[model samples]
Target: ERMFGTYFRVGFYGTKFGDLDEQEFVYKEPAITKLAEISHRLEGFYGERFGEDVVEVIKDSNPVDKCKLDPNKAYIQITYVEPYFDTYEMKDRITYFDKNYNLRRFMYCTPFTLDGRAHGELHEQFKRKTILTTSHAFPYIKTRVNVTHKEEIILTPIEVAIEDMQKKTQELAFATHQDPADPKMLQMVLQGSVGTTVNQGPLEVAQVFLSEIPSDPKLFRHHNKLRLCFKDFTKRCEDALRKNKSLIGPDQKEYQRELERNYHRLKEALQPLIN
Candidate 1:
């Protein structure tokens, strides 16, 4: 997607990928007030003294690879790579719940590296941040955490069925909903939020992505609508597992095992909401 940043805080805004996790806070600023305010209160100022200490530590280390991102583009993202925390690991960290970076470290992102996602799964494996909006201030670049997240293609469910089933029948009842933050720019399922939980459950999500094509291709309309039953919808998942296996670069057996597990999750995500 051709994304860009703006100069003033006045325009092009939004939050929540329509991703359901506590979207209750949707449309709200990352901080109800501002950074200095939150930091001061979060620090010892209003605190009975907060722990700036690691409280605990999370980690990241691999053969060490990197992306030569578009330096001119505005991309300051902080993501948490695959994290496995037990209660102590979880509790020790909650003490500073008010912190954004710490809060992000516990969450996950899609598009983990092949080495990771291959071993992980076809779905976005991990990483997260607190910002509801994709656009952040230019200075966020310095403060952002550079981390690996899984690979992803955003779109809608009916669109995905188009790819998997090709000639199979599919149904779609989707619309462009408004963002409390921006009256423009809407969320579509085939895009982000796949495999990740959003509105209701783990995320009512994936498909060919009609929005990507923008214009309707007369040849590709849902041909066999009734065939969308689970029996007819089999391609959605088989492909996540089947097609992913071929695209998986190395560690075939390991990646396949991961796919086998993801098979169920992706199957669950392929489902769409009724109109």
Candidate 2:
């Protein structure tokens, strides 16, 4: 079947100021008053950014029902979801707006199953159940406004890049450990065998282990040892696919194509991290 979706944009803007030096107190401007003045100016700036039509939409539409804005908070959210569809059916949707309402890029997310029977089964077992819903949740976008008296901007792009690189390194290290090259090692790493008390419960413990592990030489060395585990795992999966070729039935060819497409999609998704 053919797929369709819609897109919308929303944003907010504000300004801030810095403190004056104690030595230059007599000649220097007050921080709070300066910030308050900038804030007043930004009301007009935000108004122009949101525009009259968008402001009308915000005023007329219920915040509880629409964008989930809080009256007490310093920020307001404005959102519009176009061409709403029925809840039960899987849909292909994409978000195309950035933090500043700029047209950066598009990201596609689709809900398509292998077969009609499988799709029907999922619809019956999963789609009917709606669990843990929330309303009036606030959305936020934060940005730094350095009000410096210096000639040049002090922001370090290299520092940001280094932090991002370290993050990616840590993520790869975790993925390597989870690949399972050795069953004995995998069992040893399991919390149940390690006698580790999951203080925040199972999911939280898992997240802690995944996130908090530092990307040191020891961890990377262990990850390197387990590097070929996933290669073997992939081979085994392919072997199983071949063994079950007859049982795969009519959707087998389509599934193979889908897997190939997913492989390329995964590469595309990871390109930034890889780079």
Candidate 3:
């Protein structure tokens, strides 16, 4: 009976591509040097558990193309990309290109022993140990290198729909419950006053509140009340800010700091009305 009922699903697919020309490309000489350094650093730690071949596998392999590595063996691959573009223009001629390419690196590890029962247990233990150790080690290596070229694409309609739904939900909430005459709404206005050091400017506040309110006034009276409250709050905040030049901060950072400081106060003041 509810086969067509509205519901949502979300899924994501990520594909990472590496571009060669970018400075951060894994094939670059500097990146190769860094990888070698990393291999050397981890050699001692990995040697305690796995054979020396583990470090050798990473050191011997080239970072550019995984396929070029021995296809007969299995390996784990790591990639990082820096997403930025460089543009050059002269007269009517213009050129745009990625400044950095994705970096790809790989390490080959022998799979768990498939021999006897004892070996099977040993293999499971080894696998767990290596994975945990590697997780702890990766962050240290990432901090030392400069990676530029990396691309990730998410391909999933359900995931997109979920994000859209979240935005719509926020909009609906804001539109349905605002009150102009309420003390909470009044405080929001006072905070936004022109000479008010407490809140954002009237125009900015109005833009924010109006955007949240629905367009249909008659059908959504509750939303309209909230919208009115927002409007009043914006005006009050603007007026207060304008009157007290001393209250205005020297820069955006100071202004933001003041706003953040007053945010909790405003929330507390509006708690009763909000419920």
Candidate 4:
């Protein structure tokens, strides 16, 4: 299986005006809006603030190996490491990285402001700044603003099945007509919306996935379609667990069952690979 990902740097230099938290005020529903904006602009950047992408935060280390993002106090660096597989075929995936970085930080501020001035200067250095698209500026912040490319290939069919499950699950989620913000909606579909006493069900959904797992180990290991079936089923379970954070919710019991079931299944499936 071919694995794709991106690496890019985000440097907050010079000075940050107002409050970095003020970045939220740029949109009505700050966090979600930012996430939505980023999802639309940058390719493969999914989930919370920076998405599922692995971000390595860099700063001056103190006594006990600690760091924080303080734009006003000191320069902050964020490196987006290799993320997951991409189904969204973006012709300009790498190109939009710079756009996401600039717009997410300084799109609301004008060049007259100190922070905006720094962004402007950085863009000027890149020699690609103009009207209608100051956001898509190139590699600027001289200190650490560049893109790197790398890839990984999974040789084993079993491993490929495992990896494919996740990206495919993401694709499935995107394809379904549902509100991206509400985890509860996805939850309701996977696990039941529990009741006070009775088993308020929907376990059939879980069973549907479980049934997809082939009994023959050969098909499970080598065949593409069978492996994909298993992968989709596995990812479906994981997605439910990922959304099962609230313990006090009405569906907590069902979610707990989901978590336990997924854990056991993965344990059994990867037993050979684990050592």
Candidate 5:
């Protein structure tokens, strides 16, 4: 139902990139150098996968240049284009190019630490004069160079994922009930659970169960796997109910009653689908 539902993650290590030093640098050399290297890696990767001219690498070097946002800090910015076909627009239209194939532009910025401090840290320091600051431990922690790295995990367009599930849930509700509740309310409920729940893959599992088997349906005939899929969904809900039961304690009687009412309603709503 959707393309590019997941985010592409890129990692940046302080040592793998290099340490930010003040001695032999104006601003810093490793910052831009590391950025350049990372930028080229992405450029070559996407360029080979998609095509040339798709990846545009911008290095903010000069203060006078119009392309830079922060003159004091160096950055390596990457912009790439992803092409996706649109059925909603193409159903009525007969034209090629922009009418069918839509280009989605994505940009990732790699921010560097300047003088052993992040941009936010620098900003905070600038805002206060008499504040006490500790000396940073960089390029050495007693002897070995400290390796600081971070990972950015993303689901790309989270809305797309929720909306797709919303569509299926709407279909499922309509399939089971003659008079179904508002789909907007259902979407809200799902969104709330996603926000609060620490466990992952329930939505993913729901999406998988609600969707048809990929490729040709004829090739996979005589398969009753979906019967088990719906059965698993029941187990999924039961587990959720059990968890919620344990979570909402005896202290909040009002909340407990509310949860009970919601549970009963959900149980009744799902009864038809079980049959």
Candidate 6:
């Protein structure tokens, strides 16, 4: 359950109220969770997908500050307080307070695609297709801009994503026996890239997974970062298994055999002393 369990998310949105004021956040708090009416929800929402929502709250949960902005024509800072798989995309707009949410200022960053990229919309903070990359035409022929992740994907960070992948595998490990001799487990790893095997999820089947056997065996060959991360990950896994012991392999069976050997040795030695 290490992976499937609920996760927390936090977001800090640096925004100017623009045409609106602090009162916009003052009115959105009504809950009745005592009878499992709802986990919790806030109205007139505003957000980021930061890891960790253990400290969820009611309305005013949003705290706006105007400390260093009294001279900036009524400044506004809107931080996001939020959770879970994050099903919503951040389609919200930002504008200069000078002209009733003006058309110019900070444009929305397009949601990322499943491949850690997005297209369509661009902003001052980000330049779309500013660099060349590969996508549509040929394997190494041309490149496209990064854009639109999954389903209106919002401000979720990449770090959270990496951990999420790790969690996916970790959870399945917990669910099934981690025995290496298991036929199903062995079969699963046989289709994988790692020599180390255990009960795992369908991470290998997932197209985005970097460490899996795919149509092109050399598909992830050039990714130095992935190679390095995987190297370190495998190293740690080796060390952890070494320390924990009896977690995988035939160590459990070997220990049982040794106990039987000792029992026979003791019985044989007692024959002379029985008289």
Return the top candidate by TM-score: 5
- State TM-scores per candidate: 0.20, 0.19, 0.17, 0.23, 0.25, 0.24
Q: Residue 245 of candidate 5: its Cα lDDT?
A: 48
Backbone clashes counted, model 1: 24
Residue 19 error for model 2, in Å? 67
Candidate 6 C-alpha error for residue 195, in Å: 12
Candidate closer to the true structure by TM-score (higher is better), 2 or 5: 5
What's model 6's overall lDDT?
Answer: 0.29
- Model 6 lDDT, residue 173, Cα: 44
Ranking by TM-score: 5, 6, 4, 1, 2, 3
The deviation in Å at residue 53 for candidate 6 is 27
As for model 3, its CA RMSD to the true structure in angstroms is: 24.3
**lDDT score at residue 225, model 6, on the 0-100 scale:** 34
CA displacement after TM-score superposition, residue 167 of candidate 1 (Å): 22
- The stretch of ten residues in a row with the least summed lDDT in candidate 4 is 122-131
- Between candidates 1 and 2, the one scoring higher on lDDT is 1
Give candidate 1's TM-score.
0.20
Select the stronger candidate by TM-score from 4 and 6.
Answer: 6
lDDT tens readout by residue for model 5, 127-184: 1111111122222232211113212322212222333344544443443333344434
- Prediction-by-prediction clash tally: 24, 0, 33, 1, 0, 17
For model 2, residues 101-147, the per-residue Cα lDDT tens digits are 22112121112233422222211211111111111111213221112
C-alpha root-mean-square deviation, candidate 6: 21.6
- Candidates in order: C-alpha RMSD to true structure: 21.6, 23.4, 24.3, 20.7, 21.5, 21.6
